[PDB]
Copies of this chain bind each other. A is one copy, B any other.
């Protein structure tokens, strides 16, 4: 029994909400109805969850009943079916359990811990440092490079190799990724996911997700290319391989989720994901570093103390670096990359902050409202690294810190992300000092929304130390 806008007939609230700037409308509504309001976009019932309490209660307290995902019809066009749901949007069930366990364990096994992947990231972090350096003096937009660098890490783990920063196929992938991402929000997608005006209306059904489809077919190419060379006798060296060997081990039953339709989706899930997240965060990192050179200096120091200005950073350093760690965690809290997170759905009736949400209710965990809950952080809306430091000056991670959400569905890439961030971030400041272009206006801290929110375009100066 949560309050609500009470939408007009037919389209419901489909119109009362601005889908090109959702974060905004949801706050304007949490202002009228507050924390736990509800809207009915078309036939679909919804319940937006604001503030730490309402989020932790649904995702953790009643986690066993909110681990499902609401069905997303318009994904038929990408080849999603019961026989293949990948992970990201797979419904709570065994096909999802299987792929979730495969993902977490396989990545871990591919060296996601110490010595291996950790140095695969420093190898790649080098190639990035150089590309940066190769732009001596002249200011520029780092977004693109970071994106390539980070994507090369997820490529290593999934496709078995890295790509040259000049490779056209690589850059096409990156572009399609950023464009398919944008198609994850927007009025169009919403309306087709409500009114079946998409069945036999190619004009509509075609244009939507035109990039997501274009992105997936670029991968199928990479996969078939990749699968052609797969030699069973060699233990798997990348996710694709590990998956194919499972498709073999599970030749037995047609019930297994290890099959050709799933392979592209699971691989696409992880590839795309590790390709447009950390990267965006690293853009927020660098921006906030030129917008706050004072904090950049402090971190740049801690690096020289423990790590030194000559040897590459190692995960084992984070332990001895409380400031670099708090800055990074703050970059994430303030960066607030996935505002409304990822839609969940109730498996049975639940109660949150008093109201009672019925089964089949789409849940929208507004992680921004947690990442910046007024009743939690000292200075919520300002960049305050001391948010992760106690009196003695030792790093401390607060509960409200949920950039990866929580529950059975919590981001399964957190491990990779933590490592990527710390290694690329420090390796960058270790060998660099960034600042705003000498004669340019101070860059905006406002972010652009497209499901994921990145730092409004900006340039910076990269000079060596």
Tell me, rounded to whole Å, the shortest Cβ–Cβ distance linking A132 to chain B. Answer: 31
Listed stretches A24-32, A57-65, A279-287; interface member: A24-32
Question: How many copies of the polypeptide does the oligomer hold?
Answer: 2
CB-CB under 8 A from A32, the residues of chain B are 70-71, 345, 360
Cα–Cα, bound, A69→B330 (Å): 33
Closest to A45 in B: B6
Cα–Cα, bound, A7→B70 (Å): 19
Q: Are B9 and A195 closer than 8 Å at their CB atoms?
A: no
Residues of chain A at interface, number, CB under 8 A: 46
Contact among B12, B19, B382 for A254, CB-based, below 8 A: B382
CB-CB under 8 A from A31, the residues of chain B are 71, 91
CB within 8 Å for A6 and B195 given contacts A33-B360, A91-B31? no
Q: Are A196 and B25 closer than 8 Å at their CB atoms?
A: yes
CB within 8 Å for A17 and B196 given contacts A6-B45, A33-B359, A33-B360? yes
Tell me, rounded to whole Å, the shortest Cβ–Cβ distance linking A11 to chain B. Answer: 6
Cα–Cα, bound, A52→B19 (Å): 41
Tell me, rounded to whole Å, the shortest Cβ–Cβ distance linking A379 to chain B. Answer: 8
- A13-41 toward B: CB 8 Å interface, digit per residue (1/0)? 10111111100010010011110010010
Tell me, rounded to whole Å, the shortest Cβ–Cβ distance linking A253 to chain B. Answer: 9
CB-CB under 8 A from A17, the residues of chain B are 43, 196
Q: Are A195 and B16 closer than 8 Å at their CB atoms?
A: yes
Q: Are A12 and B6 closer than 8 Å at their CB atoms?
A: yes
A32, A70, A359 interface centre (most CB from chain B within 10 Å): A32
Tell me, rounded to whole Å, the shortest Cβ–Cβ distance linking A442 to chain B. Answer: 13
Cα–Cα, bound, A21→B76 (Å): 13
Cα–Cα, bound, A7→B5 (Å): 14
Is A194 located at the chain interface by the 8 A CB criterion? yes
Cα–Cα, bound, A330→B10 (Å): 42
Tell me, rounded to whole Å, the shortest Cβ–Cβ distance linking A450 to chain B. Answer: 13
Q: Are B199 and A20 closer than 8 Å at their CB atoms?
A: yes
Is A200 located at the chain interface by the 8 A CB criterion? yes
Cα–Cα, bound, A34→B195 (Å): 20
Tell me, rounded to whole Å, the shortest Cβ–Cβ distance linking A280 to chain B. Answer: 23
- Show 11 A/B contacts (Cβ-Cβ < 8 Å), sorted by A: A3-B358, A5-B45, A7-B8, A8-B10, A16-B42, A16-B195, A20-B199, A20-B200, A21-B199, A25-B196, A33-B359
CB-CB under 8 A from A45, the residues of chain B are 5-6
CB-CB under 8 A from A254, the residues of chain B are 382
Tell me, rounded to whole Å, the shortest Cβ–Cβ distance linking A1 to chain B. Answer: 11
Is A44 located at the chain interface by the 8 A CB criterion? yes
Tell me, rounded to whole Å, the shortest Cβ–Cβ distance linking A417 to chain B. Answer: 29
Cα–Cα, bound, A360→B195 (Å): 27
Is A73 located at the chain interface by the 8 A CB criterion? yes
Closest to A359 in B: B3
Tell me, rounded to whole Å, the shortest Cβ–Cβ distance linking A447 to chain B. Answer: 15
Tell me, rounded to whole Å, the shortest Cβ–Cβ distance linking A93 to chain B. Answer: 10
Tell me, rounded to whole Å, the shortest Cβ–Cβ distance linking A46 to chain B. Answer: 10
Closest to A5 in B: B43
Cα–Cα, bound, A255→B21 (Å): 25
CB-CB under 8 A from A15, the residues of chain B are 10, 195
Cα–Cα, bound, A235→B417 (Å): 55
CB-CB under 8 A from A199, the residues of chain B are 18, 20-21
CB within 8 Å for A194 and B16 given contacts A6-B40, A359-B3? yes
- A377-400 toward B: CB 8 Å interface, digit per residue (1/0)? 001001000000000000000000
- A329-361 toward B: CB 8 Å interface, digit per residue (1/0)? 000000000000000010000000000001110
Cα–Cα, bound, A32→B73 (Å): 12
- A271-304 toward B: CB 8 Å interface, digit per residue (1/0)? 0000000000000000000000000000000000
